[PDB]
C-alpha cells in the first residue's frame, strides 16, 4: 500500500538526520577557524620588526618600489612620490594620526628613581591635522609616572613635540615655563603600532634619565 | 503514486553517498587545524623575535617590565603582585608533564667513535611535591640505535635528573653504570612544547659533544 | 489524498540534509583552503630566513621535523636525498618560458643613463633530461633609454640558468663588460623578484631593480 | 566512457544551485524571522507607553498609520471599527485556561502575614459567543502561610474577567472584604504580569506581586 | 545510460520549481527590511527621549554641547567649527525635498461647519537659491474631500509658504482666494521624514482649529 | 546519441546558474541585516532612561523581583539577595567597574568661566577592586578643563571619591592639599553607561560651579 512504504522512507530520512547531527556535532568539537584576522596580525607583528636602505631622514615609498625619498617633502599636498604610495590609506590613516593614543611601560630610572621602577605613561593630548594631510602630527601629550605605590601620588608634566614619520619616533619635551620639565623619546620600530622603546630624557641635552619599554595602553 | 515516490528515492540514495563522502571530509578537516597551524607560526616567529634580562632572571608580563631572580620568582607562591606565574596558561601542568618519549637524530662531533644515529630519551619517573611546579625531579631511559660489528644493537643507559620550569631545560645524567654514557641536555623553546633542542655533554667539561633535536612521539 | 500526504514527506528532508552535508564540506574546505596554505607557508618562510641557518648557503635544508642538509647541487639527482622526499615532491618548476618581467629601478650606480625601467624577456628555456636542478635560459634584456643626443633603444641577449632550490636565476652578462643580472626569488609568490645588477666575477651589487611579471 | 563523461556533469550543478537557492531562502527568513518581529514589536510597545496618549485610557488606538480611537468596550463588536481591522486580526486570545501563575511578593501592606508567595490557579474560562471583548474566569487563589500558632493553608475562589484590549484581568474579590487582584499584562510577552492587590471599590493599590506563569 | 541520466532530470526539474519559489521569497524579503524597521524604532524612541536649549536655538552635536541662534547657525556657511551642519547626513537634500503629496485625516474642533474628513497637501513648486538649504520657499495645493448637500465635492485652495530646515516646520498660507481657507502648518519630527504633524490655524488668532497627521504618499 | 542531449542538459544548468546569480546579485543590493547587535543597543538606550520605587539609598534586585534592599549591604561577600540577582554578570561586570573610563562634555560655567564654555573631562585613574567584589569601586580620577582655545592651556586637578551603585552617581573631590580643589558629580541615570549629567562643584558645599552633559569619551 501507499501508506506503507512511506512509513519507512520517512525513517530512512529520520536516519540521515541523525547520522548528520552526529557529524555537525563532532564538528563543533573542533574549533573554529581563527579570525584570517589572525594571520593578518602575524604578518603585522612580523612585518613590524632587518634594515632599511636609507640613511637617516629618508623613508621609502610604501609601495612596490623600494625607492627612498627625503622625509621632508611630505606633503606637497600632492604626491611627492611617483608611485603615489602615499595616497594609500596605510599612510594617510586615521588611526595612525589619531590622537589620544597612550603608551605605557615600567620605567626603571638609571638616574632619579631611588625607588622601585615605576609606571610611566606618555599619552597624546592633541595633535594637528588639517584635512588632507597624509602626514605626521605635531602634537601635545602628557608624561605621567608614579611617585610610589605607597604615596599613591604621581607626576604629570605637559609636553609639546612632533612625530617623525621617517624616524618612527615620537619626540616630546616639556611645554615650558617649568624650566625643568622632562621629555621623552619613543621609537616605534618594531614595525608595530602598539609597541615602542621609550626613554625619559632631560629636555636639555636629550640625555636618558630613565628607560621603559612601552605598549599601547 | 509509484513514480514520483519511487523516484524520490534515487534522490535520497544520493544523500546517502554524499553524507558518506562528507564523513571522509570531516576526517581530512581534523588534520589541518588552522588554529593549530597559526600557533605553529606564532611560536615559530616568537622564536625569532634575546633576553633583555639577565640570565637566570624572570621577565614579567606585559604590564610592567621587570626582572626577578628565578628561584625567588617560582616560590610556588606568587613571586609578584600580578602575577605572571599565577595565570593558569603557563602553570598548566599537562603539556609539561613528563612520561613523554623523545626521539631524534644525534649528529656527533664524534667524541664517540660511532657514526651518526638516533637517540631515544624516554622519561621513566617524575617526583615533585604534590603541586610542585618549579622543579621536577626525574628518572629516564636513554637509548641509541647504533651498529656494532654484527647487527643493529641498542645502547641504553638509565638516567636521573631534573626539569627547570623556568630554565626550560631538562638535564639527564647517567646513574651508576659502568658505561657512564655522557649526559644529555634538552631545552624547551623550540616554541613547540613538543620539541626540544638537545646536546650530549660531559659534566666535568661541560662541553657540547653532539647536537640532538628531539620530538615527542605520539603516545598512540 | 492518502497517497499524496505520504509522498511529500521525503522530498523536503532529502534537502534538509543535503544542506547539513555541504555545510560541513565547507568547514572542511576552510581548513584546507589553499589561499590559507600559501599565506601561512609564506609566514613560515619569513622565519626560515631568520637566523644562522640550519643548512648551508650552499646546502639545502630538507626539512623539517628532522633536519638534514644536502647540497644544492645534490638534490635533484633523481636519487632521493630526502626521507621527506623534498628533492622530488615540489611539483612545480618555477621557471616558465615566454614570461616577460618589467623592472623598476631604484638604485643604479651601475649604468650611465640609469634607466627608469628595464624589460626582461625570456626567449627560450630547456632543462636537461638528467638534470632537474638547473634549467638553462636565453633572455633578451630590453631598454628604452633617452640619450642626450637622441633616443636609444636596446635589446641585449644573454644566456642564463635558474637554480632549482635557490629560485635564483643568474643571467650571464650580455656584455663583454661582465655586468650581469642576479635575481633571487621568493618565486611563485612573488614572481616579483629583486634584481641585482652585479660585476659577475666580483659579485658586487651596483644596481637594484624590482622586477614584476607582466601578464 | 563516452556515455559516462557526459552523465556526471548534471548532478554536481543541480546541487551547486540548490545551495544558492536555500542560501537566499535564509536571507529572506532573516527579515521575516519571528524572534526579530516580537523583539522589535516589543520595542514599539515601550514607545506606545510614552506620552499623552493618542487614544483614551478607555479608548483603544487602532493604529497606526492613521490614528483612530474606538472604545475598549467598542471593539470587538464583530462589526469592524477598524479600516485597519485590529478588532479582528489579533488572532489570539491571551487568556487560556488551566494556567497556573506563581506570584512573588515585593510590597505587601495589604495582608497581615504578607506571604512570600501566592499561587493563582485558573479553574475555568468561557467567552460569550457574542462577546469577544471580555472573557469570564473562575480562579482559586492559593496561599501557604505560616501563622504564629500553626500553619495555615488557603485556596479562596473568585470570579473575574479578562479584557480584550487591556490585557488586564480583574479578579473580583474572593473576600467579603473587597480586597481584589488586578494584573495588567504585557500579555504573551510576558505571561509574567504585575499583580496589584487593591480595595476593589477604591482602586487603592496595597500589594504588588510579580506573577510568573508556571509551566 | 538512459536511466541515471533521464532520472537526473527529475532532479533538475526540482531545482526549477525551487529556484522559482525562491524568487517569491526574495520578493517577500524586500518588504521587511530589518535595517528599516530598526530605524523606525530608533526614530520612534528618539521621539520620546524636550529641548535643553532655548527655542529657535540650534543644539550642536555630541562633541560639545552648545546652543546657537538659528539664523546665524544656518549661515549656509559653517556656523561652527565642527560643524554639525556640514556633515552630509543632515544636509541631505533629497529626503527633505518637496514635490511630495501628503494626505491624512483632519479632525476638527469644528471651526469649520463640516464633518471630519481628509486633507491632501501637495507641494506645487519650491524655490531657494541654488544651494540653498536653510529656507525653502514653496507653493502648494491643499484639497479636502468633504460632502456638501449632494455628492462628494473637493475644496482646493492654492497656498504659498516656506519650510524651515531647522524649524522642521512647513507653513502654508492661502493665496488670494476669496475662500481664504485657513492656513495649514506641519512639523517634521514624526521621526519619520515621511510623516508630519499638522494643524489648521488662523494667522491672526494663531490658534489651532484642527489636528491633521499626514503621511507622504508613495510616488509610484 | 549519448553525447547529444547532454550538450543541452549542461545548458539547462548553465541556465539556472545565471537565473540564480541574477538573484544572489539582487540580494546584495538589499542591505544586510543590522548587527541583533542593533536591537540590543536600542533595548539598552531605551532601558537606561520612569521611576523606581525606592526612596533614596535603596536599589532594586536585578532580577525578576522588583524587591528593594538597602544600598549598603553589598557585599556580604554572599548574596545579600534572596534572588541572587547579584551573582549575574550585569552586576559584577568588568566593564562597569573598569578603570580608566573617561567622560567629557562641554562645560558651561555659571560661575567661573568668563570665557566660552570649554571642554570638561573627568577620567578615572584607579579604583579598588578585590577579587570577588560585585560592587562599586572607590576610586581616583582627574578633572581637566580647557583654559582656552587661545591659551591652549588646561587645568588638571586630581580627585578621590567613590561610585554609588544605588545612586548611579559618581562623586569626586580634590584629593587634597590644594585646599582649593574642585570636585564633580556625575549622574548615570539615563540608564545608559556612556552618558552622564555631570556638574563641576565646589568640594565644600557641593555647590554647582558649572554644568556639562557628558558622554564617554
What angle separates helix D34-49 from helix D11-32, to the nearest 10 degrees?
10
Residue F88 phi/psi, 5° resolution?
A: -60, 145
Chain C: closest CA distance from residue B79 (Å): 34
Query: Could you tell me which residues come within 8 angstroms of residue D183 by beta carbon, excluding any fewer than 6 positions away?
Result: D168, D169, D171, D193, D194, D195, D196, D211
Count of residues for chain F? 217
Q: What is the CA radius of gyration of chain B?
A: 25
DSSP codes of every residue in F78-107:
S-SSSS--TTSHHHH-HHHH-S--EEEEEE
Long-range contacts made by residues E178-183, C-beta under 8 angstroms, separation at least 24?
A: E179/E155, E181/E142, E181/E155, E181/E157, E182/E111, E182/E209, E183/E159
Task: Report the alpha-carbon distance of residue F81 to residue F17 in Å, rounded.
Answer: 61
Smallest Cβ–Cβ distance between F46 and the set D14, D31, D43 belongs to D43
Report D:53-82 residues touching F (Cβ under 8 A).
none
Is the Cβ pair C47, B47 closer than 8 Å?
yes
Task: Report the alpha-carbon distance of residue E172 to residue C28 in Å, rounded.
Answer: 66
Beta bridge partners of D69: D61
What is the widest separation between alpha-carbon atoms in chain F? 103
Residue A33 Cα to chain centre, angstroms: 25
Q: Which of B165, B164, B209 is nearest to B183 (CA)?
A: B209
What is the widest separation between alpha-carbon atoms in chain E? 92
Containing A3, the helix (H) or strand (E) segment is helix A2-29
Task: Report the alpha-carbon distance of residue A198 to residue A188 in Å, rounded.
Answer: 9
Task: Report the alpha-carbon distance of residue F85 to residue F81 in Å, rounded.
Answer: 7
Q: Quick count: other Cβ atoms within 10 Å of Cβ E73?
A: 20
DSSP codes of every residue in chain D:
-HHHHHHHTTHHHHHHHHHHHHHHHHHHHHHH-HHHHHHHHHHHHHHHHSSS-SS-SSEEE--SSS--EEETTTTTSSS---SS-HHHH----S--SS-EEEEEEEEESS-SS--SEEEEEEEEEEE-SS-SSEEEEEEEEEEEEE-SSSEEEEEEEEEEEEETTTTEEEE--SSSS-EEEEEEE--STTS-EEEEEEETTTTEEEEEEEEEEE-
Task: Report the alpha-carbon distance of residue B40 to residue B53 in Å, rounded.
Answer: 25
Which residues in chain D touch residue E196, judged by CB atoms under 8 angstroms apart? none
DSSP codes of every residue in chain E:
-HHHHHSHHHHHHHHHHHHHHHHHHHHHHHH--HHHHHHHHHHHHHTT---SS-TTEEE--SSS--EEEHHHHB-SSBSSSS-TTTSHHHH-HHHH-S--EEEEEEEE-SSSSSPPEEEEEEEEEEE--SS--SEEEEEEEEEEEEE-SSSEEEEEEEEEEEEETTTTEEEEEE-S-SS-PPEEEEE--SSSSS-EEEEEE-TTT--EEEEEEEEEPP--
Report A:50-109 residues touching C (Cβ under 8 A).
53, 64-68
ω into D23 cis (within 30 of 0): no
Q: Are F115 and F107 in contact (CB under 8 A)?
A: no
Beta bridge partners of A126: A140
Which residues in chain F touch residue E5, judged by CB atoms under 8 angstroms apart? 5-6, 9
Which residues in chain A touch residue B63, judged by CB atoms under 8 angstroms apart? 106
Angle at E175 between CA E169 and CA E177, to 5 degrees: 140
Q: Which of A85, A89, A42 is nearest to A66 (CA)?
A: A85
Q: Quick count: other Cβ atoms within 10 Å of Cβ B109?
A: 11
Q: Quick count: other Cβ atoms within 10 Å of Cβ A121?
A: 21
Binding site annotation covers C79?
yes
SS3 assignment, position B113: coil
3-state secondary structure B167-210: CCEEEEEECCCCCCCCEEEEECCCCCCCCEEEEEECCCCCCEEE
E168 Ramachandran zone, left/alpha/beta (phi>0; psi -120 to 50): left
Q: Are D72 and D62 in contact (CB under 8 A)?
A: no
Task: Report the alpha-carbon distance of residue D214 to residue A68 in Å, rounded.
Answer: 76
Q: Are E21 and E165 in contact (CB under 8 A)?
A: no
SS3 assignment, position A23: helix
Q: Quick count: other Cβ atoms within 10 Å of Cβ A37?
A: 7
Task: Report the alpha-carbon distance of residue E208 to residue E215 in Å, rounded.
Answer: 20
Query: Could you tell me which residues come within 8 angstroms of residue B39 by beta carbon, excluding any fewer than 6 positions away?
Result: none
Burial class (CB in 10 A: 0-12, 13-18, 19+), D25: middle
Q: Which of D109, D121, D112, D138 is nearest to D209 (CA)?
A: D109
CA dihedral F205, F210, F214, F217 (to 10 degrees): -90
Task: Report the alpha-carbon distance of residue F63 to residue F89 in Å, rounded.
Answer: 12
Chain F: closest CA distance from residue E61 (Å): 11
Binding site annotation covers B40?
no
Is the Cβ pair E35, F34 closer than 8 Å?
yes
Is the Cβ pair B5, C24 closer than 8 Å?
no
Q: Which of B131, B133, B124, B108 is nearest to B210 (CA)?
A: B108
Residue in F with minimal Cα distance to A142: F156
Q: Are F112 and F209 in contact (CB under 8 A)?
A: yes
Residue B59 phi/psi, 5° resolution?
A: -85, 125
Q: Which of D134, D123, D107 is nearest to D210 (CA)?
A: D107
In this structure, what DSSP letter does residue C84 have? Answer: S
Task: Report the alpha-carbon distance of residue F48 to residue F41 in Å, rounded.
Answer: 11
Chain F: closest CA distance from residue A31 (Å): 24
Task: Report the alpha-carbon distance of residue A158 to residue A136 in Å, rounded.
Answer: 20
User: How many beta-carbon contacts under 8 Å exist across B and E?
Assistant: 9
Q: Are B60 and B74 in contact (CB under 8 A)?
A: no
ω into D76 cis (within 30 of 0): yes
In this complex, is the C-beta atom of A160 within 8 Å of any C-beta atom belonging to chain F?
Answer: no
Is the Cβ pair C43, B25 closer than 8 Å?
no
Is the Cβ pair D67, E213 closer than 8 Å?
yes
Q: Are C55 and C63 in contact (CB under 8 A)?
A: no
Residue in B with minimal Cα distance to C41: B41
Is the Cβ pair B26, A32 closer than 8 Å?
no
Beta bridge partners of F108: F211
Q: Are E217 and E119 in contact (CB under 8 A)?
A: no
Q: Are C76 and C90 in contact (CB under 8 A)?
A: no
Q: Are C141 and C158 in contact (CB under 8 A)?
A: yes
Which residues in chain E touch residue D40, judged by CB atoms under 8 angstroms apart? 37-38, 41
Q: What is the CA radius of gyration of chain C?
A: 25
Chain A: closest CA distance from residue B8 (Å): 10
In this complex, is the C-beta atom of F150 within 8 Å of any C-beta atom belonging to chain A?
Answer: no
Residue E48 phi/psi, 5° resolution?
A: -85, -45
CA dihedral B107, B112, B113, B118 (to 10 degrees): -40
Q: What is the CA radius of gyration of chain A?
A: 27
How far the first Cα of chain A sits from its last, in Å, is 75
Which residues in chain A touch residue F156, judged by CB atoms under 8 angstroms apart? 156
DSSP codes of every residue in E61-81:
-SSS--EEEHHHHB-SSBSSS
Question: Cα–Cα distances in Å, from C26 out to C22, C44, F17?
Answer: 6, 25, 19
Which residues in chain C touch residue D22, judged by CB atoms under 8 angstroms apart? 15, 19
Report E:17-76 residues touching D (Cβ under 8 A).
18-19, 22, 25-26, 28-29, 32-34, 37-38, 41, 44-45, 47-48
Question: D149-171 burial, b if ≥16 CB within 10 A, otherwise e?
Answer: eeeeeeeeebebbbbbbbbbbbb
Q: Which chains touch F (3 or more CB pairs under 8 A)?
A: A, D, E
In this structure, what DSSP letter does residue F166 have? Answer: T
Long-range contacts made by residues E73-81, C-beta under 8 angstroms, separation at least 24?
A: E73/E166, E74/E133, E74/E134, E74/E165, E74/E166, E76/E131, E76/E132, E76/E133, E76/E134
Containing C35, the helix (H) or strand (E) segment is helix C34-49
Question: Cα–Cα distances in Å, from A55 out to A86, B161, C194?
Answer: 20, 52, 20
Q: Which of C17, C196, C16, C46 is nearest to C108 (CA)?
A: C196
Question: Cα–Cα distances in Å, from D7 out to C114, D84, F10, F17, F52?
Answer: 61, 57, 10, 18, 73
Question: B144-167 burial, b if ≥16 CB within 10 A, otherwise e?
Answer: bebeeeeeeeebbbebbbbbbbbe
Q: Which of D51, D85, D55 is nearest to D70 (CA)?
A: D55
Burial class (CB in 10 A: 0-12, 13-18, 19+), F95: exposed
Report E:61-120 residues touching F (Cβ under 8 A).
62-66
Residue A101 phi/psi, 5° resolution?
A: -75, 135
Count of residues for chain D? 215
Task: Report the alpha-carbon distance of residue F145 to residue F127 in Å, rounded.
Answer: 22
Q: Quick count: other Cβ atoms within 10 Å of Cβ F206?
A: 12
Sign of torsion over alpha carbons C159, C162, C163, C168: positive
Is the Cβ pair C22, D19 closer than 8 Å?
yes
Q: Are A47 and A191 in contact (CB under 8 A)?
A: yes
SS3 assignment, position B125: strand
Question: C38-74 burial, b if ≥16 CB within 10 A, otherwise e?
Answer: ebbebbeebbeeeeeebbeeebbbbeeeebbbbebbb
User: How many beta-carbon contacts under 8 Å exist across D and F?
Assistant: 63
Task: Report the alpha-carbon distance of residue E118 to residue C200 in Å, rounded.
Answer: 94
Task: Report the alpha-carbon distance of residue D61 to residue A140 in Å, rounded.
Answer: 59
Is the Cβ pair E64, F119 closer than 8 Å?
yes
Task: Report the alpha-carbon distance of residue E97 to residue B116 in Å, rounded.
Answer: 87
Amino acid at each position: 500500500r501507499f501508506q506503507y512504504l512511506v512509513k519507512n522512507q520517512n525513517l530512512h530520512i529520520d536516519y540521515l538526520a541523525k547520522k548528520l547531527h552526529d557529524i555537525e556535532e563532532e564538528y563543533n568539537k573542533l574549533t573554529h577557524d581563527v579570525d584570517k584576522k589572525t594571520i593578518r596580525q602575524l604578518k603585522a607583528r612580523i612585518s613590524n620588526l632587518e634594515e632599511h636602505h636609507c640613511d637617516e631622514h629618508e623613508s621609502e615609498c610604501r609601495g612596490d618600489v623600494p625607492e627612498c625619498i627625503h622625509d621632508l617633502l611630505f606633503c606637497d599636498g600632492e604626491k611627492d612620490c611617483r608611485d603615489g604610495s602615499d595616497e594609500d590609506p596605510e599612510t594617510c590613516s586615521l588611526n595612525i594620526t589619531h590622537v589620544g593614543s597612550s603608551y605605557t611601560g615600567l620605567a626603571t630610572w638609571t638616574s632619579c628613581e631611588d625607588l622601585n621602577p615605576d609606571h610611566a605613561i606618555v599619552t597624546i593630548t592633541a595633535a594637528h591635522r588639517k584635512s588632507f594631510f597624509p602626514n605626521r602630527v605635531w602634537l601635545r601629550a602628557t608624561l605621567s609616572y608614579e611617585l610610589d605605590e605607597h604615596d599613591h601620588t604621581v607626576s604629570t608634566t605637559q609636553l609639546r613635540g612632533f612625530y617623525n614619520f621617517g624616524k618612527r619616533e615620537l619626540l616630546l619635551a616639556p611645554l615650558k615655563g617649568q624650566s625643568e620639565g622632562y621629555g621623552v623619546i619613543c621609537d616605534f620600530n618594531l614595525g608595530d603600532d602598539d609597541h615602542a622603546d621609550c626613554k625619559i630624557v632631560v629636555p636639555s641635552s636629550l640625555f636618558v634619565c630613565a628607560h621603559f619599554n612601552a605598549q599601547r595602553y | 503514486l509509484d513514480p514520483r515516490l519511487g523516484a524520490n528515492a534515487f534522490l535520497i540514495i544520493r544523500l546517502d553517498r554524499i553524507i558518506e563522502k562528507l564523513r571522509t571530509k570531516l576526517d581530512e578537516a581534523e588534520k589541518i587545524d588552522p588554529e593549530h597551524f597559526v600557533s605553529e607560526i606564532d611560536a615559530r616567529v616568537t622564536k625569532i623575535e634575546g633576553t633583555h634580562c639577565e640570565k637566570r632572571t624572570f621577565q614579567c608580563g606585559g604590564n610592567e617590565q621587570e626582572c626577578i631572580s628565578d628561584l625567588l620568582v617560582c616560590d610556588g607562591h606568587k613571586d609578584c603582585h600580578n602575577a605572571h606565574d599565577e595565570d593558569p596558561d603557563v602553570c598548566d601542568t599537562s603539556v609539561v608533564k613528563a612520561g613523554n618519549v623523545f626521539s631524534g637524530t644525534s649528529t656527533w662531533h664524534g667524541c664517540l667513535a660511532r657514526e651518526d644515529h638516533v637517540t631515544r630519551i624516554t622519561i621513566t619517573a617524575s617526583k615533585r611535591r604534590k603541586f610542585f611546579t618549579a622543579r621536577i625531579w626525574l628518572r629516564a631511559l636513554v637509548e641509541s640505535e647504533l651498529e656494532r660489528h654484527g647487527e643493529n644493537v641498542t645502547s641504553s643507559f638509565n638516567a636521573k635528573g631534573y626539569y627547570n620550569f623556568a630554565s626550560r631545560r631538562l638535564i639527564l645524567l647517567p646513574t651508576d653504570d659502568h658505561d657512564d654514557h655522557l649526559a644529555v641536555v634538552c631545552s624547551f623553546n623550540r616554541g613547540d612544547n613538543e620539541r626540544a633542542e638537545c646536546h650530549r655533554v660531559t659534566e666535568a667539561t661541560l662541553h657540547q659533544c653532539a647536537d640532538l633535536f628531539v620530538t615527542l612521539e605520539e603516545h598512540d | 489524498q492518502s497517497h499524496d500526504e505520504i509522498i511529500d514527506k521525503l522530498i523536503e528532508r532529502t534537502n534538509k540534509i543535503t544542506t547539513s552535508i555541504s555545510h560541513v564540506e565547507s568547514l572542511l574546505d576552510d581548513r584546507l583552503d589553499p589561499k590559507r596554505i600559501r599565506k601561512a607557508g609564506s609566514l613560515r618562510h619569513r622565519v626560515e630566513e631568520l637566523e644562522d641557518p640550519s643548512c648551508d648557503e650552499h646546502e639545502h635544508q630538507c626539512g623539517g621535523d628532522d633536519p638534514q642538509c644536502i647540497s644544492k647541487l645534490f638534490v635533484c639527482d633523481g636519487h632521493n636525498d630526502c626521507r621527506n622526499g623534498e628533492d622530488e615532491k615540489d611539483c612545480t618548476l618555477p621557471t616558465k618560458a615566454g614570461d616577460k618581467f618589467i623592472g623598476d629601478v631604484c638604485f643604479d650606480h651601475c649604468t650611465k643613463r640609469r634607466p627608469e625601467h628595464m624589460t626582461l624577456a625570456f626567449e627560450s628555456s630547456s632543462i636537461a633530461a638528467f638534470f632537474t636542478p638547473i634549467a638553462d635560459l636565453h633572455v633578451h634584456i630590453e631598454i628604452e633609454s633617452e640619450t642626450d643626443e637622441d633616443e636609444s633603444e636596446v635589446s641585449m641577449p644573454a644566456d642564463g640558468e635558474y637554480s632549482f632550490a635557490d629560485h635564483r636565476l643568474t643571467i650571464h652578462p650580455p656584455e663583454e663588460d661582465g655586468l650581469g643580472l642576479v635575481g633571487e626569488f621568493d618565486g611563485y609568490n612573488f614572481d616579483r623578484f629583486v634584481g641585482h645588477i652585479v660585476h659577475e666575477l666580483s659579485e658586487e651589487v651596483c644596481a637594484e631593480f624590482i622586477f614584476h611579471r607582466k601578464k
